[PDB]
Amino acid sequence: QSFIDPKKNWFAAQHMKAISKRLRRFGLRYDDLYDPYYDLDVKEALNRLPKEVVDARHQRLKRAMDLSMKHEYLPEDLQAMQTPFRGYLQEMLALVKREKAERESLGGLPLYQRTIP
Amino acid sequence: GGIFEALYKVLMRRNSVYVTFVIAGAFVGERAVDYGVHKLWEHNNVGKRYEDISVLGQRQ
Amino acid sequence: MRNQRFSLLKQPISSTLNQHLIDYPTPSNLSYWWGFGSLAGICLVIQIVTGVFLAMHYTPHVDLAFNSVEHVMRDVEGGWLLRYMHANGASMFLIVVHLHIFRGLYHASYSSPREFVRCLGVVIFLLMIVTAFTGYVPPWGQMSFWGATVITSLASAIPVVGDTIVTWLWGGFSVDNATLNRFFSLHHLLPFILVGASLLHLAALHQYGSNNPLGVHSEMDQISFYPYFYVKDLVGWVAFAIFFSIWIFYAPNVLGHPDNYIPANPMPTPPHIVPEWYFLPIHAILRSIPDKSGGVAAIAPVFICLLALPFFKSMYVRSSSFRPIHQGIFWLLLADRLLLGWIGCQPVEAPFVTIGQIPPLVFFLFFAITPIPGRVGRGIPNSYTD
Amino acid sequence: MRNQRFSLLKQPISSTLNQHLIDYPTPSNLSYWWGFGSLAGICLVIQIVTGVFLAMHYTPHVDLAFNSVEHVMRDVEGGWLLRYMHANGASMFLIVVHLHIFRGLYHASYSSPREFVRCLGVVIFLLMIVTAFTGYVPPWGQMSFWGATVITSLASAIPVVGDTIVTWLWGGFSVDNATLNRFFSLHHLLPFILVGASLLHLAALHQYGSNNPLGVHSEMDQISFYPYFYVKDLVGWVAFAIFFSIWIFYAPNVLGHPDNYIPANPMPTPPHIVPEWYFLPIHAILRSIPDKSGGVAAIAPVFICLLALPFFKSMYVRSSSFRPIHQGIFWLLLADRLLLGWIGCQPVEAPFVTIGQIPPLVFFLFFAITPIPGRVGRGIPNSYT
Amino acid sequence: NEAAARFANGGAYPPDLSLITKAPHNGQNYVFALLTGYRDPPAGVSIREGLHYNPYFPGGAIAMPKMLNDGAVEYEDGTPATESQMGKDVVSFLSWAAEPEMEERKLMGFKWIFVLTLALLQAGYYRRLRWSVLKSRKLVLDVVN
Amino acid sequence: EIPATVAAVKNPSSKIVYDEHNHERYPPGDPSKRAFAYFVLTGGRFVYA
Amino acid sequence: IQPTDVKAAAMWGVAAATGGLYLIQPWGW
Amino acid sequence: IQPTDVKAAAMWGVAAATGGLYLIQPWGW
Amino acid sequence: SLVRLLILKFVLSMSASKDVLALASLEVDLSSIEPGTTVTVKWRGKPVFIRRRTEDDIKLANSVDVGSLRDPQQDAERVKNPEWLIVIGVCTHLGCIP
Amino acid sequence: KGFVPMKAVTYGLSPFQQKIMPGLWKDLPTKIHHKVSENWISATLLLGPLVGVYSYVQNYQEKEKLSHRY
Numbered sequence A: 001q002s003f004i005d006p007k008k009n010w011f012a013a014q015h016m017k018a019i020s021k022r023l024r025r026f027g028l029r030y031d032d033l034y035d036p037y038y039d040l041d042v043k044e045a046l047n048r049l050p051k052e053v054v055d056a057r058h059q060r061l062k063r064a065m066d067l068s069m070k071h072e073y074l075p076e077d078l079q080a081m082q083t084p085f086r087g088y089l090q091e092m093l094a095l096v097k098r099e100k101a102e103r104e105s106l107g108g109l110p111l112y113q114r115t116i117p
Numbered sequence B: 001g002g003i004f005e006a007l008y009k010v011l012m013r014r015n016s017v018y019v020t021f022v023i024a025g026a027f028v029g030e031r032a033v034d035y036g037v038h039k040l041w042e043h044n045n046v047g048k049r050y051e052d053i054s055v056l057g058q059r060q
Numbered sequence C: 001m002r003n004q005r006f007s008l009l010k011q012p013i014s015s016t017l018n019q020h021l022i023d024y025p026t027p028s029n030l031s032y033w034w035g036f037g038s039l040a041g042i043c044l045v046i047q048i049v050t051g052v053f054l055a056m057h058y059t060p061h062v063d064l065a066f067n068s069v070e071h072v073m074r075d076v077e078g079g080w081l082l083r084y085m086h087a088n089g090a091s092m093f094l095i096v097v098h099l100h101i102f103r104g105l106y107h108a109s110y111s112s113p114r115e116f117v118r119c120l121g122v123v124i125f126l127l128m129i130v131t132a133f134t135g136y137v138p139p140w141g142q143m144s145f146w147g148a149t150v151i152t153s154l155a156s157a158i159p160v161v162g163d164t165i166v167t168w169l170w171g172g173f174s175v176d177n178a179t180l181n182r183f184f185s186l187h188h189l190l191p192f193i194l195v196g197a198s199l200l201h202l203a204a205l206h207q208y209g210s211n212n213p214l215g216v217h218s219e220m221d222q223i224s225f226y227p228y229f230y231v232k233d234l235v236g237w238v239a240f241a242i243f244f245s246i247w248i249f250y251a252p253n254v255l256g257h258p259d260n261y262i263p264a265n266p267m268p269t270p271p272h273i274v275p276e277w278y279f280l281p282i283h284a285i286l287r288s289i290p291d292k293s294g295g296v297a298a299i300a301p302v303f304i305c306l307l308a309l310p311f312f313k314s315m316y317v318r319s320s321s322f323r324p325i326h327q328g329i330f331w332l333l334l335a336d337r338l339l340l341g342w343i344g345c346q347p348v349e350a351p352f353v354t355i356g357q358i359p360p361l362v363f364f365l366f367f368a369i370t371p372i373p374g375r376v377g378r379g380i381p382n383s384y385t386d
Numbered sequence D: 001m002r003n004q005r006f007s008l009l010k011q012p013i014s015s016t017l018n019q020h021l022i023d024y025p026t027p028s029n030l031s032y033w034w035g036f037g038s039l040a041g042i043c044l045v046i047q048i049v050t051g052v053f054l055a056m057h058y059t060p061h062v063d064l065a066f067n068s069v070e071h072v073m074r075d076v077e078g079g080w081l082l083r084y085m086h087a088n089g090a091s092m093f094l095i096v097v098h099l100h101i102f103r104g105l106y107h108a109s110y111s112s113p114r115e116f117v118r119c120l121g122v123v124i125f126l127l128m129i130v131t132a133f134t135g136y137v138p139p140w141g142q143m144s145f146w147g148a149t150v151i152t153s154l155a156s157a158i159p160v161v162g163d164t165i166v167t168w169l170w171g172g173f174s175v176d177n178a179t180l181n182r183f184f185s186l187h188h189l190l191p192f193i194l195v196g197a198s199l200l201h202l203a204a205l206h207q208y209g210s211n212n213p214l215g216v217h218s219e220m221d222q223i224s225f226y227p228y229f230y231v232k233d234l235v236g237w238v239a240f241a242i243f244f245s246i247w248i249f250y251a252p253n254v255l256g257h258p259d260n261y262i263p264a265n266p267m268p269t270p271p272h273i274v275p276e277w278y279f280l281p282i283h284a285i286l287r288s289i290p291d292k293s294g295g296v297a298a299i300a301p302v303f304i305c306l307l308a309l310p311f312f313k314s315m316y317v318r319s320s321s322f323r324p325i326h327q328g329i330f331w332l333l334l335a336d337r338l339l340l341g342w343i344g345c346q347p348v349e350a351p352f353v354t355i356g357q358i359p360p361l362v363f364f365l366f367f368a369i370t371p372i373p374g375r376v377g378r379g380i381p382n383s384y385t
Numbered sequence E: 001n002e003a004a005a006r007f008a009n010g011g012a013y014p015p016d017l018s019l020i021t022k023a024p025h026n027g028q029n030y031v032f033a034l035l036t037g038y039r040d041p042p043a044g045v046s047i048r049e050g051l052h053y054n055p056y057f058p059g060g061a062i063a064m065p066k067m068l069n070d071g072a073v074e075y076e077d078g079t080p081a082t083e084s085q086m087g088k089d090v091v092s093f094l095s096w097a098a099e100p101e102m103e104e105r106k107l108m109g110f111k112w113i114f115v116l117t118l119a120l121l122q123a124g125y126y127r128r129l130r131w132s133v134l135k136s137r138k139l140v141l142d143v144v145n
Numbered sequence F: 001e002i003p004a005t006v007a008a009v010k011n012p013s014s015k016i017v018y019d020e021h022n023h024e025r026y027p028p029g030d031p032s033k034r035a036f037a038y039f040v041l042t043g044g045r046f047v048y049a
Numbered sequence G, H: 001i002q003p004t005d006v007k008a009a010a011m012w013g014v015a016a017a018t019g020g021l022y023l024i025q026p027w028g029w
Numbered sequence I: 001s002l003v004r005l006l007i008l009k010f011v012l013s014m015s016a017s018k019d020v021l022a023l024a025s026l027e028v029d030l031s032s033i034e035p036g037t038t039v040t041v042k043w044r045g046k047p048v049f050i051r052r053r054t055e056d057d058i059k060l061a062n063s064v065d066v067g068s069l070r071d072p073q074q075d076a077e078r079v080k081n082p083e084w085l086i087v088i089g090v091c092t093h094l095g096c097i098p
Numbered sequence J: 001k002g003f004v005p006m007k008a009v010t011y012g013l014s015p016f017q018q019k020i021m022p023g024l025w026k027d028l029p030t031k032i033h034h035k036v037s038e039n040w041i042s043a044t045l046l047l048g049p050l051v052g053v054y055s056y057v058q059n060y061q062e063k064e065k066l067s068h069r070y
């Protein structure tokens, strides 16, 4: 987009700095905030990934929840050693959505459905 | 201190004793705070009470 | 199976209470903003008990209602305590539920999979408003009479059916004894429906668990409910009791209008008619329009937007901690909602017409704007990636 | 299975209604005596609705209550229908519950594992009695006033503490406006507690399932509830509606006492005081013993015996079909509890005192004897081979 | 009745004084300053005959005439019956008449606020004691970023 | 390199560090404080009664 | 049976004390 | 696929209107 | 048919009763009032707005643009008197007594 | 509603072996400074419009009243 990019717009670099600061202070990546109960396609995208990546995801989530309960933040060195925005989930999610659309176009039933609450 | 341990061994090896202790403490503390608040109330404003009007018995 | 019994707390008799109160798993980083649901439950119970004991000394007739309320306060042992608890616990109950709603708005609790909970909450809010308004009448003062007149005659603005439904509602040609007795029966009935809706609300929440100040998956680190959140609820309850009793014992009339100590007189009108303090935002939105049909049908967008928030389906991050712009919009909406509240208690002239017409515009731009962040931020991973 | 939605009935939004109303497996040989629970639920809903609409016109004061009832019944469009439905649906509700209790007492449904259900039923019966008696007062006629006086002054047979209890219950020194206001509030409140108790009753039944006219293990041959017993319940409801309409439209005053059409007067007394038709066996039991303390202390053993039926570890056969002597005793008890009711309305004099003293003896001897058949029937399998 | 009351005062009804302090805004001071506030009208304003002027009345013109005057009553204690003393005594009487429960109310309030503050202290300690075990727990997780 | 989570299983050291950012510990050797706990809690149970 | 009997005795004593306090409520006892 | 659904919707609307004119019987409209 | 019966009976039980409909029409008496002033009166359940305007009020009220009023009418049809103006006292806006 | 395989290790200490109260009032000023520095913008955005509208209304009312005099 012409104005979403941080390269050409000065009101997006500030946004990414804020988000990166808030993600680092708890030590978790931007793709960790996607929930498998929310979209029901994140569930498949995560189901198809290798085991070690998902295990690292679970460990990071537990670390952040412990930090929040204790009301503190990671030390400065373990804050320097942090990389948010290093995705592991975008491409698989896009691929799953592409197959979903292509199956919808040519007739075809859905593969999994949200449950009525 | 050691008095806390002595109180603990005296009162809490059973439970019915604990219930009785709680009830007794309640119905003693109630009286104590009643006495304290009544006394402070009397002290704060002297001369205004009903038994302090100088003409209470001169409408016979 | 366990071919011999272990615990009373896992037997069939206590299975429901155990599973939904004692052993239920909750996130371990819930803060103090998660106690107001239980606190509101206790407020509802207080209202019900106090009302069942007031209704033993009150007579619903136009000749007797005012004098029966004063008889309660002057001639029954402790009756003043009952009346003050009731008339101030309504205000406490509204305060607590407002804080609950704004908690839900902050950490974005309406999104999937928790939109049934939000919809049931909105229905509960409607029942609460109806119950309080119906029950402000039975004392039969000046504001009772004239507030009932204004609000229930606001229903003749509707096309052709208007006068018919107003006359059927009033039971006659004006607000009189029939309306009083009718409203008393409705007031005694509605809170039990409120109880039922609350229990359904809780079941709907327990079928997926609660959110947390982070808005992430939370199935790896959970703790039971007892004794870890029971003690936190206890702290909340004791603080609430201190506040409630400061209201009851040392300032029991600050939260009311003085005019309700004058018996109803249909001929003279008060110079400044307003309802209670917790209907003033709706009242200001309602008088903000110079048209009856528009004014009445502007409340409908309020409830439609509140009931249609959950169904926007692009936003991916729930908590406002990682969303600066939506956080700022939340605070600005709070300020605007307070401004509506203050305006709803003023005379209708300059300079209050403009300041009563713009805040509704902001209150609707809130429910219009939020999907735009949804879309514009769905594509955020692709731009900021490292 | 569970990867995409098959039926909306098996979804969470309607899972429990499905499980407990549509699919719930029931024995396939149930007869009509299993429709009265649903019929009683219908009766309770009718009472609640007509009450919520009646209390929209009634004023609870000793100066304006009789006039409020007459204004309702003489001046409101169709108000006579509401009043008659309420005052006769109370009678219908009591009839349905009496038949329900006697059914459960025939096929021995109290025994294990269904005694928690019996206990909840007895609690419900107390709530019903309390609600009806409290609500017979608000019209404020002769019978209302004097029945309230008599029954609430029976509460002074208790030793020393009794007089304070009575004075607190009356709200003063006699039956007056405070009693009227208090009774109205209690009458409006109690039916919701009754609803809650009924729901607990039903869940405690469903946790094991229902009995059957044979009293045997019945899990091999069972069917669904809908549509196979719903239609049977429909037939029951339609016959019930015919009976109810006959009472409402063509004989609405036959099930009451005329004296409640005289405004209350504390100075005169009616020459014949009785409670509403469905309180009479208890009245006869209470007047049988010529002593106040005995009078109050006779009704507690009645409910104690009722609530302690299911805990006698007893005979291994439930259905009274395979039990000639329990069958005969059931018919004797049923005849006795009708004779008692008829006696509970006559003057207190000869011969009625003797014939009011012996039926309570029999009514307690029923609960006395019944364990003995269980113990003496332990040994049938070892003898009649 | 009220009809006779209006007839005897020129169509103006003198209200009931039971709740007269709670019914208007700022009761005590309003009643006192109203009684002691009859004054000379400002320049440029006139009052129709049969009415009197009082700035403490919304409208500027009132119907009742002044009553509190030096010596209008004779006490039994020897207090100079000035207009202000009489007004103060009247307002005290009316305040008692409106709120006869004030002292019992304040006593219960003081007692229970104190007691509940103590209970709050105890509950806070209870809370901290229970949560101490989780809030100082240490865990090792095997992940860097 | 060995995982951090497995080096702590095959090394049963007895020198343990907790998180003192919130709660300090008593020096090792000191008695318990159960009695003082009951002492503090009874003062609130009285009030609730 | 003896520990159970004395446990029941203590429970009965608690209940009896509370009931006696219900019957007469002396403020300065 | 649209025609059958829309025809059924129109007929259901007819049924709803007929039910409304059964519950209320206004000759002034 | 039965469901319709029950619904109609219960919903029409809440309408105005014969007692209230009996008192819905009558005529009572007023008293005198000064030119341009008003003393309100009473009827079955509704007061009476009153005004007998002077010359200047006649000038001001009778000389306003006709189209700018959302219910275009002139007072000459609304007034039954060159000076008086009696109108039933219930606010057609919200039923108050303005 | 399920759980996940985790692989973690935790150590704990008993409740009755550690000081409880002294944690509340340990280093208050730095916590206060952190809270203020973090939420100054939220406080500003919450309390701005109220002050602006109140001042505007007061000014308008006093101007109108003082202009109606003689």
Ligand SMILES: CCCCCCCCCCCCCCCCCC(=O)OC[C@H](COP(=O)(O)OCCN)OC(=O)CCCCCCCCCCCCCCCCC
Pocket: A110, A113, A114, A115, A116, A117, C115, C116, C119, C120, C123, C303, C304, C307, C308, C311
């Ligand atoms: C004041 C007058 C009011 C009159 C009514 C006004 C209504 C305005 C509402 C406007 C908002 C739009 C509502 C649209 C509802 C359905 C939309 C929807 O998305 O449903 C679909 C979704 C599941 O479908 P999905 O999996 O997403 O699609 C598969 C594609 N292959 O379905 C789900 O996700 C299931 C979610 C169920 C939760 C919602 C249930 C309804 C709300 C409950 C409140 C009602 C409770 C009332 C209780 C008392 C009853 C009187």
Ligand code: HEC
Pocket: E009, E012, E013, E014, E015, E020, E031, E034, E035, E057, E061, E062, E063, E064, E065, E067, E068, E090
């Ligand atoms: C001459 C008979 C009379 C006397 C005696 C009298 N009043 Fe009045 N009072 C009136 C009338 C007439 C009104 C109604 C005033 C009006 O409506 O303009 C009134 C009204 C009032 C009001 C209502 C003012 C308001 O703002 O509504 C108060 C307060 C009051 N009186 C106080 C007193 C007190 C105190 C006394 C004893 C010192 C007293 N009155 C004695 C005739 C009297």
Ligand code: HEM
Pocket: C033, C034, C035, C036, C037, C038, C040, C041, C044, C097, C100, C101, C104, C109, C110, C117, C118, C121, C122, C124, C125, C198, C201, C202, C205, C209, C210, C211, C212
């Ligand atoms: C009588 C009124 C109410 C009662 C008794 C009540 C009670 C509760 C309780 C006990 C909870 C779970 C415990 C908690 O999270 O604190 C809860 C959750 C919730 N309630 Fe309510 N509430 C009421 C009104 C409302 C209203 C009016 C709304 C919205 C308009 C609402 C929205 C929510 C939401 C969104 C949640 C989700 C909790 C979460 O995100 O974890 N509630 N309610």
Ligand code: HEM
Pocket: C044, C047, C048, C050, C051, C052, C054, C055, C058, C069, C083, C086, C087, C090, C093, C128, C131, C132, C135, C136, C137, C138, C139, C187, C188, C191
């Ligand atoms: C069974 C439930 C209830 C009963 C029997 C009941 C009964 C009563 C009665 C008799 C009155 C008139 C007495 C008086 O006004 O002093 C009253 C007033 C009132 N009730 Fe209730 N009530 C119940 C529940 C509630 C609830 C749940 C609410 C609000 C959520 C509520 C709000 C009010 C209010 C605001 C008043 C006004 C009293 C005043 O302002 O003076 N009531 N109630």
Ligand code: HEM
Pocket: D033, D034, D035, D036, D037, D038, D040, D041, D044, D097, D100, D101, D104, D109, D110, D114, D117, D118, D121, D122, D124, D125, D198, D201, D202, D205, D209, D210, D211, D212
């Ligand atoms: C409002 C009052 C009552 C209601 C709504 C009610 C409702 C029900 C229902 C719906 C059933 C299951 C349906 C059936 O088996 O026919 C049932 C069963 C049962 N009820 Fe009640 N009942 C009531 C009163 C009583 C009372 C007073 C008792 C006993 C004193 C009682 C004892 C029983 C028993 C023993 C069963 C067992 C069913 C079986 O044997 O299969 N009920 N009840």
Ligand code: HEM
Pocket: D047, D048, D050, D051, D052, D054, D055, D058, D069, D083, D086, D087, D089, D090, D093, D131, D132, D135, D136, D137, D138, D139, D187, D188, D191
């Ligand atoms: C919310 C529930 C209820 C309400 C609001 C209600 C209301 C009333 C009212 C206002 C009356 C006096 C009017 C009159 O006597 O005609 C009345 C009478 C009565 N009620 Fe109810 N009621 C309720 C439930 C019940 C129930 C469940 C019963 C069960 C038997 C019952 C039994 C009676 C009886 C026997 C009378 C007097 C009959 C007579 O007037 O001859 N009520 N009720």
Ligand code: FES
Pocket: I091, I092, I093, I094, I095, I096, I097, I098
């Ligand atoms: S009646 Fe005139 S504005 Fe309401």
